Design a protein around this ligand. Structure first.
Ligand SMILES: [Ca+2]
Ligand SMILES: [Ca+2]
Lengths: 196, 525
């Protein structure tokens, strides 16, 4: 079906995918946030809580240690705002428009909660909050940082220390070099060095 | 995550091709969000991770893009030397320095609400993640992208707005986190970039372990983007990736365990090299193979076969096993959907491998296997096990060649004995029940975001979405699937959106929906 939210035409195809037709990027990115919230508001809320370390407010003590890790390694709102302030002014404005679109749905849903707030909000007995551009950065960080963050250096130190104390240093060093190599020159690569 | 880009000379149609397969798990609502974006000079269709104001898997008017996790070295742990008189002080560049202190309050739902308080610490290097009080040490964590995550968002938005290689490469140069980016355009070009900000480390330290934090071993800036692995129109005519190493001399310190001689990207290499020119149907066949392959077969099944053949005159059961192993297509698949893997010998091979890995390492690494099993039996490859069993050079002599051969044989006899006892002597009786999965309520961020789905589907070593894109002269064309469905809404009364899980059947049955780009096609979909 085709619909008009403000000055943006939204065409939803047979799988429900929204196709947004806007006259400029400011309108487009507001509609982008809006349709995402229409479709996924509870998921967005919980992903944001994940980054903020406030899941235990909803799901209890089982998520306290996860909340603690998220706050330990995370950023304050002011720190994220300082990040946004360093972007190109147009980019920052579009992230703000995206948050304004999510917020537009939040406001609509909280005014008509029995029809537009999803079952999880009713079952867990809380309301979604409005969004700022800093919250959009939190959505990015909660998932993308997972693929970058690891403590394997600490695991490796423990492997080496535990091998040393049982086998001695000379043998432990050789074993570790086979476990965690410096460079396996036979590892398959996506490009060859002549292609650089 | 896997990806392929195919240049014009390797494509049947002469058009560049792109394939995406991000592996972010399987949840309902899904981890991805599909959309079409259209404003003047900006037309783009595809998906991104939930909440992202940009497309990561898809195409604009000019170019297609995708990404896989880079596994580049962007996190370092610093070992801080603490003041024995004050554990909140660490030594750095000649003086005791004070940690930054932060008190955080956590409200916990009982049951009523509880208020917990914890204190968190920062050093010059970053957040304190661990304490070894017994050694007067604190461990802090440095990310090369600390404070530049918003710049990475901007770089991805610029990639969406880009119209050519130069603009895309400019965006790539601004991205600060470790990803592989893949590009294909309507002019026939393809391009690969290992993006991220990679620090210049001290040459006095072993980068597999934590760095002393006393000030003599600090990062010395970041290397230029021109030093990141990258290629435009590589001579081979294509790029494939399944999180493997970018280039021969590119290192990633503590996480080298994912970039060894035995690596799962071999499934994609094998499939592309087995073919001449390819089309999207070929790319889908390669995805199918990778999704169902028993990955240890590539290097370990020839070794097993060769060993059994040396002794099949002695053991009359070995000739049969060799015949069954040779005819097996190396997949754990269920083509007739009868709920059992089609090749009985795959059950034998699974058990053989489990037995072999245990015999190889239990008597030396058993005591550290809580840390090493995840290395030696890694999902991307078992390089050390292969080197030991094949007699190739290793730093430590884990097993003599004679001992390695005895392991292969003993593992065979034990696996076959168990199958004969419990199933019988014909391989068809060994067929194992398929492993299934559901699109559940908890993603890799490890907190619930919904109620999931109970629909069971065969397990596939496969992207959470797939796009297949051909950059034709007119426009991007192709097909995709984005399970479980577009819309995560469940009504208060329990009614699921009609689009909550209407792509699960497509996903499970290797069917796809058309990639829509022309507005005239969008209105009739
Ligand atoms: Ca590191
Ligand atoms: Ca079957």
């Amino acid at each position: 079906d085709q619909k008009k939210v403000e000055n943006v035409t939204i065409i939803r195809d047979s799988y429900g995918v929204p196709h947004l037709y806007a006259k400029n990027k400011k309108d487009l990115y507001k509609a982008y946030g809006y349709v995402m919230a229409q479709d996924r508001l509870f998921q967005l809320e919980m992903f944001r809580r994940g980054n903020e370390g406030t899941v235990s407010e909803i799901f209890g003590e089982e998520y306290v240690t996860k909340d603690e890790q998220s706050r330990r390694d995370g950023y304050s709102d002011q720190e994220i705002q300082t990040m946004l302030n360093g972007l190109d002014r147009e980019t920052k404005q579009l992230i703000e428009q995206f948050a304004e679109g999510i917020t537009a749905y939040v406001n609509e849903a909280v005014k008509a909660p029995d029809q537009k707030l999803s079952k999880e909000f009713h079952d867990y007995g809380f309301l979604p909050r409005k969004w700022k551009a800093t919250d959009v950065v939190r959505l990015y960080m909660v998932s993308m940082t997972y693929f970058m963050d690891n403590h394997q250096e600490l695991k490796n130190a423990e492997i080496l220390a535990r091998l040393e104390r049982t086998y001695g240093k000379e043998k432990a060093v050789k074993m570790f070099d086979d476990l965690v190599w410096k460079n396996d020159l036979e590892a398959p690569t996506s490009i060859q060095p002549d292609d650089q | 995550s896997n990806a392929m880009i195919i240049g014009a000379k390797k494509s049947k149609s002469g058009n560049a091709l792109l394939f995406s397969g991000p592996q972010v798990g399987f949840v309902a609502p899904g981890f991805l969000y599909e959309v079409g974006l259209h404003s003047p000079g900006f037309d783009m269709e595809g998906s991104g991770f939930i909440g992202y104001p940009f497309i990561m898997f898809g195409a604009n008017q000019h170019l297609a893009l995708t990404a896989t996790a880079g596994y580049g070295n962007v996190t370092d742990i610093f070992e801080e030397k603490l003041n024995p008189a004050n554990s909140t002080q660490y030594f750095y560049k000649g003086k005791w320095r004070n940690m930054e202190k932060r008190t955080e309050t956590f409200i916990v739902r009982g049951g009523k609400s509880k208020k917990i308080e914890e204190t968190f610490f920062h050093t010059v290097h970053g957040p304190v993640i661990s304490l070894d009080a017994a050694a007067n040490v604190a461990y802090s964590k440095s990310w090369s992208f600390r404070g530049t995550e918003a710049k990475s968002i901007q770089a991805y938005m610029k990639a969406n707005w880009a119209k050519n290689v130069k603009e895309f490469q400019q965006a790539a140069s601004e991205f600060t986190m470790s990803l592989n980016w893949y590009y294909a355009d309507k002019k026939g070009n393809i391009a690969y970039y290992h993006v991220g900000k990679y620090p210049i480390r001290s040459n006095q330290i072993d980068d597999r372990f934590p760095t002393p934090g006393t000030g003599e071993y600090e990062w010395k800036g970041f290397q230029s983007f021109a030093k990141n692995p990258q290629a435009i129109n590589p001579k081979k005519g294509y790029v494939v990736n399944w999180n493997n190493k970018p280039s021969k001399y590119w290192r990633n310190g503590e996480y080298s365990i994912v970039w060894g001689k035995d690596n799962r990207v071999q499934q994609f290499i094998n499939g592309i090299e087995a073919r001449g020119k390819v089309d999207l149907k070929d790319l889908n066949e390669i995805n199918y193979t990778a999704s169902f392959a028993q990955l240890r077969t590539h290097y370990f099944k020839p070794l097993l076969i060769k060993t059994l053949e040396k002794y099949q005159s002695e053991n009359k059961e070995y000739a049969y096993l060799v015949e069954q192993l040779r005819k097996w297509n190396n997949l754990k698949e269920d083509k007739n959907h009868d709920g059992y893997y089609d090749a009985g010998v795959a059950a034998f091979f699974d058990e053989w491998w489990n037995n072999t890995h245990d015999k190889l390492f239990n008597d030396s690494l058993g005591i550290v296997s809580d840390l090493t099993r995840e290395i030696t039996d890694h999902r991307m490859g078992a390089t050390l096990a292969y080197k030991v069993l094949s007699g190739e050079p290793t730093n430590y002599q884990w097993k003599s060649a004679a001992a390695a051969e005895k392991i292969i044989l003993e593992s065979t006899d034990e696996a076959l004995a168990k199958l004969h006892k419990e199933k019988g002597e014909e391989a068809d009786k060994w067929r194992a029940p398929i492993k299934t999965m559901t699109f559940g309520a908890k993603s890799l961020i490890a907190i619930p975001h919904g109620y999931g789905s109970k629909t069971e589907i065969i397990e596939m070593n496969r992207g959470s979405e797939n796009h297949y894109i051909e950059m034709t002269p007119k426009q991007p064309e192709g097909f995709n699937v984005t399970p479980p469905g577009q819309i995560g809404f469940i009504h208060k009364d329990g009614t699921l959106s009609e689009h909550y899980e209407d792509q699960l059947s497509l996903y499970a049955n290797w069917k796809f929906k058309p990639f829509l780009f022309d507005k005239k096609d969008v209105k009739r979909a």
